[PDB]
Amino acid sequence: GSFVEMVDNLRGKSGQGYYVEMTVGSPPQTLNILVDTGSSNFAVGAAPHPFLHRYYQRQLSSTYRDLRKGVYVPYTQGKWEGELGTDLVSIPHGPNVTVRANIAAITESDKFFINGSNWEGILGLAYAEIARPDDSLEPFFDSLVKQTHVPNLFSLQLCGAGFPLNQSEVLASVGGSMIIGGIDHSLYTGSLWYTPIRREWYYEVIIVRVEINGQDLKMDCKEYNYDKSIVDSGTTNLRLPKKVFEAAVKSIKAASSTEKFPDGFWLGEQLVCWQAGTTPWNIFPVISLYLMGEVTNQSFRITILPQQYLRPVEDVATSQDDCYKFAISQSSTGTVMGAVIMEGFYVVFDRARKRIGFAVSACHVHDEFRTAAVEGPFVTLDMEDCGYN
Amino acid sequence: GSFVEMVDNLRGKSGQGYYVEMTVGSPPQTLNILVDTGSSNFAVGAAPHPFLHRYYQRQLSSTYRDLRKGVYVPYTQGKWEGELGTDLVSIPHGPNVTVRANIAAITESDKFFINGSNWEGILGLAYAEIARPDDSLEPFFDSLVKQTHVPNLFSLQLCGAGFPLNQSEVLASVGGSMIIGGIDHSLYTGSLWYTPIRREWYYEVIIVRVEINGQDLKMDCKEYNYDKSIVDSGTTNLRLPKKVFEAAVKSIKAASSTEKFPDGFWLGEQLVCWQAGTTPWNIFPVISLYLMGEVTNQSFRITILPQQYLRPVEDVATSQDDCYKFAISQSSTGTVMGAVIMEGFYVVFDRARKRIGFAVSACHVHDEFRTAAVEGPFVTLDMEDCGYNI
Numbered sequence: 001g002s003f004v005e006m007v008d009n010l011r012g013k014s015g016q017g018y019y020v021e022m023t024v025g026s027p028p029q030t031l032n033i034l035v036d037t038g039s040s041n042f043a044v045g046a047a048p049h050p051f052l053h054r055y056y057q058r059q060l061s062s063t064y065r066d067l068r069k070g071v072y073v074p075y076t077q078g079k080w081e082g083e084l085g086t087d088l089v090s091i092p093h094g095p096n097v098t099v100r101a102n103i104a105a106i107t108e109s110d111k112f113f114i115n116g117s118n119w120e121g122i123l124g125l126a127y128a129e130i131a132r133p134d135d136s137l138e139p140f141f142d143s144l145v146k147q148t149h150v151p152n153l154f155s156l157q158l159c160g161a162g163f164p165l166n167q168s169e170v171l172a173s174v175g176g177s178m179i180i181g182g183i184d185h186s187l188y189t190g191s192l193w194y195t196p197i198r199r200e201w202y203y204e205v206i207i208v209r210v211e212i213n214g215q216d217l218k219m220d221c222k223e224y225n226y227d228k229s230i231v232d233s234g235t236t237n238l239r240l241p242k243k244v245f246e247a248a249v250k251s252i253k254a255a256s257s258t259e260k261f262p263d264g265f266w267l268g269e270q271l272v273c274w275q276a277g278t279t280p281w282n283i284f285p286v287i288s289l290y291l292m293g294e295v296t297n298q299s300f301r302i303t304i305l306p307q308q309y310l311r312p313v314e315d316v317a318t319s320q321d322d323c324y325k326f327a328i329s330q331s332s333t334g335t336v337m338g339a340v341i342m343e344g345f346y347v348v349f350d351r352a353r354k355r356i357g358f359a360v361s362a363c364h365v366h367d368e369f370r371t372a373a374v375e376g377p378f379v380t381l382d383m384e385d386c387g388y389n
Numbered sequence: 390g391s392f393v394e395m396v397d398n399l400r401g402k403s404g405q406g407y408y409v410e411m412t413v414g415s416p417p418q419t420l421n422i423l424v425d426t427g428s429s430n431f432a433v434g435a436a437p438h439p440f441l442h443r444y445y446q447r448q449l450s451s452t453y454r455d456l457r458k459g460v461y462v463p464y465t466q467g468k469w470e471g472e473l474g475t476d477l478v479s480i481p482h483g484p485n486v487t488v489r490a491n492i493a494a495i496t497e498s499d500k501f502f503i504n505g506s507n508w509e510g511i512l513g514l515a516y517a518e519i520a521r522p523d524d525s526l527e528p529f530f531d532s533l534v535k536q537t538h539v540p541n542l543f544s545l546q547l548c549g550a551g552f553p554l555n556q557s558e559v560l561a562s563v564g565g566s567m568i569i570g571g572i573d574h575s576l577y578t579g580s581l582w583y584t585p586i587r588r589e590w591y592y593e594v595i596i597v598r599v600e601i602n603g604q605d606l607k608m609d610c611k612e613y614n615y616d617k618s619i620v621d622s623g624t625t626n627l628r629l630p631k632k633v634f635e636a637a638v639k640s641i642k643a644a645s646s647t648e649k650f651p652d653g654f655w656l657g658e659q660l661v662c663w664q665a666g667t668t669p670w671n672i673f674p675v676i677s678l679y680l681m682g683e684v685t686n687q688s689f690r691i692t693i694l695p696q697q698y699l700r701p702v703e704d705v706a707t708s709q710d711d712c713y714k715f716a717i718s719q720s721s722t723g724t725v726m727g728a729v730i731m732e733g734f735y736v737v738f739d740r741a742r743k744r745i746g747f748a749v750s751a752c753h754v755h756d757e758f759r760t761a762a763v764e765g766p767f768v769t770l771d772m773e774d775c776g777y778n779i
């Protein structure tokens with residue numbers, strides 16, 4: 001019920017990613033690696049890059065094995081490309097094991113590495129179905145479970161500070177915990193509620209109802225999951241399908257109407273600032289996402305505060321004002337429950353029982369009047385119909 | 390053909406430079422001078438060097454004037470040092486005028502002069518902003534325009550042979566034309582299309598779209614001009630910013646995938662050879678660069694063939710094979726539309742109207758199936774956003 005060695009093993013923030021220390025090769029080469037539930041490749045910088053101060057040097061590892069195969073991962077105006085191989089991998093603040101795992105050695109990239117993120121690679125924690133070049137490239141977690149006795153589960157506690165962390169602060173601050181092979185009860189309060197993993201590719205889930213300050217968004221529930229809904233620690237925002245996004249922004253604007261904000265704010269592009277300590281949290285609504293339960297015709301809900309969906313950012317003038325960006329944005333690839341949502345909760349990726357658990361996080365940001373919540377059950381019918389085909 | 394006295398006044402090739410004959414001093418001293426749109430100094434060898442068979446002898450010129458100032462010019466590879474002065478300068482196959490111009494007399498150099506290039510100096514045709522030591526040293530063309538009635542424009546037709554030229558052939562062959570003060574209609578076909586000169590320092594332009602065999606490279610257009618894009622007759626290759634180069638090479642490899650080439654070829658280091666006459670031009674893609682037009686929201690494109698981007702080179706075994714080097718390479722200083730690109734086109738440097746014109750060259754190398762092209766217009770929005778800002 002406690003995994004002391006793994007508690008507080010994460011660093012980072014929602015805007016740039018949460019990462020864990022890993023070692024690759026013999027002798028071990030230490031790297032900081034993005035914890036990414038939204039992808040399935042273990043890919044590390046393996047050549048000089050202006051944003052990297054270290055990278056994987058294959059020629060210095062006696063245990064390096066060349067798979068003699070390339071891998072190309074393009075995004076919309078950007079990419080990563082590399083060379084496949086295998087090597088011995090360990091997680092210093094993880095299970096006391098060493099695994100032989102696939103590694104994509106990144107040789108070229110465009111708009112991939114982030115200046116000041118402090119990470120040099122990515123740990124794709126999702127399933128083989130979405131691994132590149134194809135599903136035959138076993139993901140890291142699959143190798144870890146196959147080669148050791150580590151239980152087939154991991155849990156994430158991502159801790160948003162609630163205020164901007166400068167360069168030195170973010171390197172010194174504890175950003176959360178990745179518990180590998182278990183659940184640590186000190187990381188959450190209340191009960192854990194589980195939603196089924198719909199299909200094993202991304203960590204896909206089904207949203208059955210959406211509320212803004214208890215008011216039903218009242219859309220056909222298939223809209224909420226068009227074309228899928230996923231839990232992604234590697235996405236900053238809560239991202240919503242176009243139609244859902246438009247309806248949600250209209251409702252959030254209506255609820256917060258006592259103050260008017262420029263359109264650039266609602267586009268997640270420009271910041272909004274208030275005098276130190278005067279952020280008007282109470283004018284912004286809570287957002288409730290109802291998820292399919294494990295029991296027939298039953299759902300539960302997770303409730304998010306503006307302390308989660310308003311992302312703290314430093315002002316251009318580095319003033320004493322408290323500034324934020326709107327961390328809800330449009331998607332054309334379905335709902336994405338990103339880092340800003342995960343920061344409210346302790347999230348259990350129970351691969352063994354094909355389900356994801358949510359509980360209120362012991363590190364979520366709130367105020368004296370409202371708290372994030374995980375509650376249930378609720379009677380909900382035809383929930384399978386909310387899934388898109 | 391309105392400028393017969395200037396037509397065919399160039400010699401040289403893309404690998405070593407195109408040069409024009411000039412005279413300096415009184416009595417005139419003849420020198421061959423690199424035509425360089427990528428720099429702004431008129432600099433000539435003025436002391437013995439192993440690769441020079443002649444140089445400027447200031448002590449023999451009655452019109453020489455010493456400016457009593459030194460100049461130090463380092464490049465990526467190579468550098469030179471000189472002594473500044475002025476003298477009377479003429480272009481025998483040029484306008485029939487004589488002008489007093491600044492001259493940097495090169496007294497010391499390292500990896501600057503090229504063995505067998507046949508040129509003894511450089512004619513920097515770009516703007517004062519990039520002149521050395523600073524912008525107060527008036528460039529040659531500025532002096533020419535100020536002192537005479539020559540219109541503020543020049544045009545270049547660089548003629549690539551399409552095959553290697555030995556030492557004897559390169560000296561006897563016509564390498565192209567530099568028309569000073571005008572546009573000669575015999576040097577091009579079709580229409581001239583103009584792109585704005587973004588800023589007067591280098592001949593800076595803005596590329597708004599890139600295609601490989603009609604397939605959009607699909608990069609943010611700012612990437613194509615990061616940190617600038619220039620037209621440089623003094624650069625051999627088409628040079629592209631790192632990310633653009635990586636994307637272009639991947640696409641060129643994919644288009645030419647029926648034949649595999651070693652990594653050294655794509656690095657522009659090693660040659661590739663085919664049996665005489667069998668170069669598989671058709672497997673290589675055409676490359677289109679769209680440039681900002683003179684009209685709002687309008688662009689045009691220039692299309693080049695592998696006959697431009699594959700530079701003919703003599704085989705190591707001087708065999709009968711047709712050999713080439715890949716003449717596209719990476720840059721950390723922005724896009725450079727070098728000589729191999731300019732060989733496809735007649736290029737008008739319209740300084741008076743702050744614009745550069747392109748038209749299909751009457752001397753471009755092609756095959757029976759494809760030709761280089763200059764076409765337009767194309768509707769293109771937010772082109773100003775393609776320009777880079779520090």
Ligand SMILES: COc1cccc(-c2cccc([C@]3(C)CC(=O)N(C)C(N)=N3)c2)c1
Nearest residue numbers: 014015016017038039112233234235236339
């Ligand atoms: C909160 O997590 C992040 C914050 C900023 C950037 C990234 C990030 C950077 C580069 C690649 C990824 C990626 C592999 C690809 C991607 O687009 N997503 C959404 C993802 N989950 N992982 C993330 C993660």
Ligand SMILES: COc1cccc(-c2cccc([C@]3(C)CC(=O)N(C)C(N)=N3)c2)c1
Nearest residue numbers: 403404405406427428464622623624625728
């Ligand atoms: C096609 O033009 C050339 C081919 C080979 C070499 C040169 C050349 C040699 C020495 C200096 C220059 C220079 C003055 C400096 C430079 O690096 N570039 C790119 C330039 N435009 N002119 C060119 C020109």
